Tab-separated table of C-alpha atoms in Angstrom:
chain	number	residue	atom	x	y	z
A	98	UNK	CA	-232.372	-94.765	-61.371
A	99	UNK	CA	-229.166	-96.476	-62.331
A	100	UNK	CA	-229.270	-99.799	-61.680
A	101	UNK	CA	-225.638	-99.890	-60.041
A	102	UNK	CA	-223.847	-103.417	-59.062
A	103	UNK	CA	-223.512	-104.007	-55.370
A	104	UNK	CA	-220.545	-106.450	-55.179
A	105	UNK	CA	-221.537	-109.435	-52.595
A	106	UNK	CA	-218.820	-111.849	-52.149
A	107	UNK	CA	-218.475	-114.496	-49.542
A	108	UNK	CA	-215.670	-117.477	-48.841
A	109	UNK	CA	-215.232	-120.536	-46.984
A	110	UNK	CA	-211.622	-121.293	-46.355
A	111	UNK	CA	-210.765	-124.356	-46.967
A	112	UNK	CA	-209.086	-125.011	-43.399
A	113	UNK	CA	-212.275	-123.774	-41.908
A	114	UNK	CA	-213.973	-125.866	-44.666
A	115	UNK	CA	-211.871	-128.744	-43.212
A	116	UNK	CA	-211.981	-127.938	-39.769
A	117	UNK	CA	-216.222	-128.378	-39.681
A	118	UNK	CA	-216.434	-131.202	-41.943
A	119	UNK	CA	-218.377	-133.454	-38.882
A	120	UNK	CA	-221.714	-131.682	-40.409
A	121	UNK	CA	-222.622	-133.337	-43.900
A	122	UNK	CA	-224.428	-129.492	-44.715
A	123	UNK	CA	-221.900	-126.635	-43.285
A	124	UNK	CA	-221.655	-125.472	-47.222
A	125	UNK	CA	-225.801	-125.316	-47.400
A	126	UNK	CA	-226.193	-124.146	-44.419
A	127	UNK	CA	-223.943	-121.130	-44.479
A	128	UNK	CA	-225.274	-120.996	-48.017
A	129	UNK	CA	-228.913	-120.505	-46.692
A	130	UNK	CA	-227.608	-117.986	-43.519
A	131	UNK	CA	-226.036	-115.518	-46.608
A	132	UNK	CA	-228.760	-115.633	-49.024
A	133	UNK	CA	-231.275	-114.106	-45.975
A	134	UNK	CA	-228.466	-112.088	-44.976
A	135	UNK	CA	-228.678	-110.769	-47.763
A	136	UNK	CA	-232.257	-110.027	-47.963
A	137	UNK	CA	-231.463	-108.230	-44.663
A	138	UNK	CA	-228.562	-105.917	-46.778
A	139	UNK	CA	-231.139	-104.971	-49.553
A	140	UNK	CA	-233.684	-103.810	-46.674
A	141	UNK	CA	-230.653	-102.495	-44.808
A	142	UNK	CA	-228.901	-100.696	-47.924
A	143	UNK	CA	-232.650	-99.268	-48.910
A	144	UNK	CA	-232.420	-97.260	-45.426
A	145	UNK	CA	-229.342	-96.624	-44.074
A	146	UNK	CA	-227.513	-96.657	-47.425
B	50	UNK	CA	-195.788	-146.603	-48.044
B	51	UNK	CA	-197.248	-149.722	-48.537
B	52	UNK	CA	-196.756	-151.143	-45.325
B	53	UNK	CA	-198.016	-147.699	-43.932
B	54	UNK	CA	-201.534	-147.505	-43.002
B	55	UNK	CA	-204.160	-145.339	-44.749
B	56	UNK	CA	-207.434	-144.194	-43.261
B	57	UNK	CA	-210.193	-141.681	-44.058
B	58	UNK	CA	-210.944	-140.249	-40.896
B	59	UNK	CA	-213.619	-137.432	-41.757
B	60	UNK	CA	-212.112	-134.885	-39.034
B	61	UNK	CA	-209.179	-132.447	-39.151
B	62	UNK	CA	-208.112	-133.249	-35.669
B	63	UNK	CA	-208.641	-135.719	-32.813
B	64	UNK	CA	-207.514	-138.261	-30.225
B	65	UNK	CA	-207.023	-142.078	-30.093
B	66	UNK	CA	-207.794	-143.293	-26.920
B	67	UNK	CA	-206.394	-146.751	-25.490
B	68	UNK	CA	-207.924	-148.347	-22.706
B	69	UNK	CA	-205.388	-150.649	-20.957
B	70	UNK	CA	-205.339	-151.517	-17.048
B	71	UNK	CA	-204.282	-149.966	-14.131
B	72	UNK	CA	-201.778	-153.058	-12.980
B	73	UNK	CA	-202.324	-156.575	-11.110
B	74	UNK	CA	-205.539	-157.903	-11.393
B	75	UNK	CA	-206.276	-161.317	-9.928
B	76	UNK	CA	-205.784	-161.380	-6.064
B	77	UNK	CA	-207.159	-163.959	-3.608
B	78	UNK	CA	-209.467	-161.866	-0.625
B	79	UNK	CA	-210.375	-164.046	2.758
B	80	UNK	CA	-214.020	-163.281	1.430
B	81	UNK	CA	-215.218	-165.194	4.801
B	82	UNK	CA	-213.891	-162.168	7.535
B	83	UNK	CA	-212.761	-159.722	4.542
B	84	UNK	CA	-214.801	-158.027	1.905
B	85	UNK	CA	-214.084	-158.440	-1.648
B	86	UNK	CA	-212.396	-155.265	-2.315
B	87	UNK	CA	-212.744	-154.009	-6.011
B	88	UNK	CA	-210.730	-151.870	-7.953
B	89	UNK	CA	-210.763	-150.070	-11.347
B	90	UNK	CA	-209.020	-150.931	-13.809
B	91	UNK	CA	-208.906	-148.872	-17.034
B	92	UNK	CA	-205.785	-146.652	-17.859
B	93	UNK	CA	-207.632	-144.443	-20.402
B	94	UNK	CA	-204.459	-142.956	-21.822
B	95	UNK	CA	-205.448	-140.173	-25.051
B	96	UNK	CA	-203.309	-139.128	-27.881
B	97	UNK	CA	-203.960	-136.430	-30.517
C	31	UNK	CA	-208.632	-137.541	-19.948
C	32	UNK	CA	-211.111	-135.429	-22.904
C	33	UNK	CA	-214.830	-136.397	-22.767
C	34	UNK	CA	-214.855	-134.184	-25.637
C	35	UNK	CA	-217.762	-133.158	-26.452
C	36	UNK	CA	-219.881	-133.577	-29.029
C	37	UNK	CA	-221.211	-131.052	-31.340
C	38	UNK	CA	-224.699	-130.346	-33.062
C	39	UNK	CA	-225.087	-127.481	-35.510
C	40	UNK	CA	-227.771	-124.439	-35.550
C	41	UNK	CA	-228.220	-121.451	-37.226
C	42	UNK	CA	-228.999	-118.466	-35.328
C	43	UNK	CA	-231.825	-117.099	-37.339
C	44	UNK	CA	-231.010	-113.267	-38.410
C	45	UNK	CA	-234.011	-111.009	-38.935
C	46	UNK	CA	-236.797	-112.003	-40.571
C	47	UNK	CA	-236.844	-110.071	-44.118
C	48	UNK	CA	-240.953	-110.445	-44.420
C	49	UNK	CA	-240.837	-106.767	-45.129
D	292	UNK	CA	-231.549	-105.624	-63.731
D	293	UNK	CA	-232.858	-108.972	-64.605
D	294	UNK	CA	-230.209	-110.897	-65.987
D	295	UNK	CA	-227.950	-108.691	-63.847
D	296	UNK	CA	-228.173	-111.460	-60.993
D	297	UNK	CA	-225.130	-112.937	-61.516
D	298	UNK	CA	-223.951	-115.933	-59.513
D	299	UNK	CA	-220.406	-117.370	-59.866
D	300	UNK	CA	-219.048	-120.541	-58.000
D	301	UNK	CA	-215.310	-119.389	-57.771
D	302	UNK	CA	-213.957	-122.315	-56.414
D	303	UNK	CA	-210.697	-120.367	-56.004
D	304	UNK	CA	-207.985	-123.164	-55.096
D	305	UNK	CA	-205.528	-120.396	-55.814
D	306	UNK	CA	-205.916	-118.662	-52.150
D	307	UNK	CA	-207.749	-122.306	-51.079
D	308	UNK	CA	-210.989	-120.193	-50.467
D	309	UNK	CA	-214.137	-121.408	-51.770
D	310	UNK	CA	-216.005	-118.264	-53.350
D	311	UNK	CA	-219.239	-116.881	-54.201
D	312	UNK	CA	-219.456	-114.057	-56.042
D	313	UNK	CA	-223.228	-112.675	-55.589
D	314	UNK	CA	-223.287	-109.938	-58.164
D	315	UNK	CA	-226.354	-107.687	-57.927
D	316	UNK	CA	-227.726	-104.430	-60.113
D	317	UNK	CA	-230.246	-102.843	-58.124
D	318	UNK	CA	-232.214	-99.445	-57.732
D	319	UNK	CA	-233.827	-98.109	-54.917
D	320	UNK	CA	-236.633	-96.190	-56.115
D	321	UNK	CA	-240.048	-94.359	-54.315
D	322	UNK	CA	-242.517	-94.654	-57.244
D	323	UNK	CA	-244.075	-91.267	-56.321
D	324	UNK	CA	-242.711	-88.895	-53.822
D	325	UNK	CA	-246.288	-87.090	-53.326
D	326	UNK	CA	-247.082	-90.233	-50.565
D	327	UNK	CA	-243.450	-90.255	-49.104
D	328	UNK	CA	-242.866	-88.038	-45.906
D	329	UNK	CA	-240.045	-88.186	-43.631
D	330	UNK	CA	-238.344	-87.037	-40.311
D	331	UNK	CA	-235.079	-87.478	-39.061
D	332	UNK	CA	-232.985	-86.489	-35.923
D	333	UNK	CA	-235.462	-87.245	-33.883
D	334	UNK	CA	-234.138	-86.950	-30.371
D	335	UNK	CA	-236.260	-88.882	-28.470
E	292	UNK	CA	-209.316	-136.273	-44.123
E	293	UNK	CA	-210.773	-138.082	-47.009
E	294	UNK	CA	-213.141	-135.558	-48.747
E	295	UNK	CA	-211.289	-132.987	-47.572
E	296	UNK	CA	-208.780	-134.098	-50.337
E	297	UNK	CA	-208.837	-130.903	-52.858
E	298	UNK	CA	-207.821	-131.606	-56.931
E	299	UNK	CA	-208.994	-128.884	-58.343
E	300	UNK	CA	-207.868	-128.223	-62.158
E	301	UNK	CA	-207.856	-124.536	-62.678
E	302	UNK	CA	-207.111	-124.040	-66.273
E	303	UNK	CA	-205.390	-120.540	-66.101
E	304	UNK	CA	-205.443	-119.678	-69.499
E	305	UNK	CA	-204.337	-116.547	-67.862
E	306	UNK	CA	-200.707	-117.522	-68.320
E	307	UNK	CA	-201.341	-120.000	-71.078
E	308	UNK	CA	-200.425	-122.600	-67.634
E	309	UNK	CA	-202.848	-125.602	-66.681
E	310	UNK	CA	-202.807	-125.325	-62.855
E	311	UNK	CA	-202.729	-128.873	-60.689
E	312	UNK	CA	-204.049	-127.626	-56.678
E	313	UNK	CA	-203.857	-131.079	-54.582
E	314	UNK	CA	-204.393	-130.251	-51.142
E	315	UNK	CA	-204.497	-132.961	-48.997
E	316	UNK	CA	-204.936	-133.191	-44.953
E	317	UNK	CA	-202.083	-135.542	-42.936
E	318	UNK	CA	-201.522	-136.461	-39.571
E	319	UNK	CA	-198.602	-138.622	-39.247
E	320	UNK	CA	-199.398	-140.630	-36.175
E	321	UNK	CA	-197.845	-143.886	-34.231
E	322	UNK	CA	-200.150	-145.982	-33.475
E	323	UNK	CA	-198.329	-147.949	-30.424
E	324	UNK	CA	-195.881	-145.363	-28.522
E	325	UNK	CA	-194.888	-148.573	-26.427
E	326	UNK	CA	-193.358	-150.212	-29.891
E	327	UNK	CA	-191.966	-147.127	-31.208
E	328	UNK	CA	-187.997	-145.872	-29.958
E	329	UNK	CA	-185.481	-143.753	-31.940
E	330	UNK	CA	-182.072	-142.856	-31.846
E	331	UNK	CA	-180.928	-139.466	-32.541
E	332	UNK	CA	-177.458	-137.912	-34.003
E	333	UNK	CA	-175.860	-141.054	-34.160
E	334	UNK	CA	-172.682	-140.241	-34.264
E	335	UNK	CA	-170.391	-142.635	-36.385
């Protein structure tokens, strides 16, 4: 079983960064949505990969 | 640049919005066979 | 003119990855 | 891989994107096959 | 947009270059249209 590296990469423009900065936690919660999304690619890659 | 204001508005983009009136104001009404007839009065005019 | 709104954030919860 | 989970804060003024760069090793394994049946194409 | 100010210091040792990124948001505004009036191509 080689352990290969699946490259996950997310970014956060900085004029989208900008654009929401009337929440005081866009960066945590966007931070939270990708870390279950990517619980949901692990199950996701397990099957349909 | 010193004379120039500074502010730290924490939004990219939005409006300022002035209030002002809509003219004349003060007018006599023959309150004892006429009602008072009222008016509004607030230009709310909005830049960006 | 604008009574421009106002804005409240929520996540729209993706699948739950209990599994 | 333990120690393969490899976070990196990017904060990549360069292209004025903030990154994240979520490297992951991983394996998908079924510990024995004897217990692991399967069907596919199933049309309905 | 105070806090939305970016100085970020990326030391690119890459090209053997120390990399200054100041982003900064403006909006250059009059406050009072009423006491604001130009004049434009004056010509002298």
């Amino acid at each position: 079983y080689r352990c290969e590296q699946t490259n996950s990469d997310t970014h956060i423009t900085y004029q989208k960064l900008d654009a929401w900065a009337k929440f005081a936690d866009f960066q945590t919660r966007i931070r939270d949505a990708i870390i279950k999304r990517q619980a949901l690619d692990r199950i996701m890659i397990g099957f349909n990969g | 640049l010193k004379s120039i204001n500074f502010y730290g508005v924490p939004e990219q983009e939005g409006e300022k919005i002035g209030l002002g009136v809509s003219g004349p104001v003060a007018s006599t009404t023959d309150t004892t066979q006429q009602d008072r007839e009222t008016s509004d009065i607030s230009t709310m005019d909005g830049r960006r | 003119v604008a009574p421009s709104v106002q804005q409240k954030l929520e996540t729209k919860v993706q699948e739950s990855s209990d599994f | 891989q333990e120690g393969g989970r490899r976070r990196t804060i990017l904060d990549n003024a360069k292209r004025d994107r903030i990154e994240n760069y979520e490297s992951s090793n991983d394996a998908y394994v079924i510990e024995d096959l004897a217990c692991a049946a399967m069907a596919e194409n199933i049309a309905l």
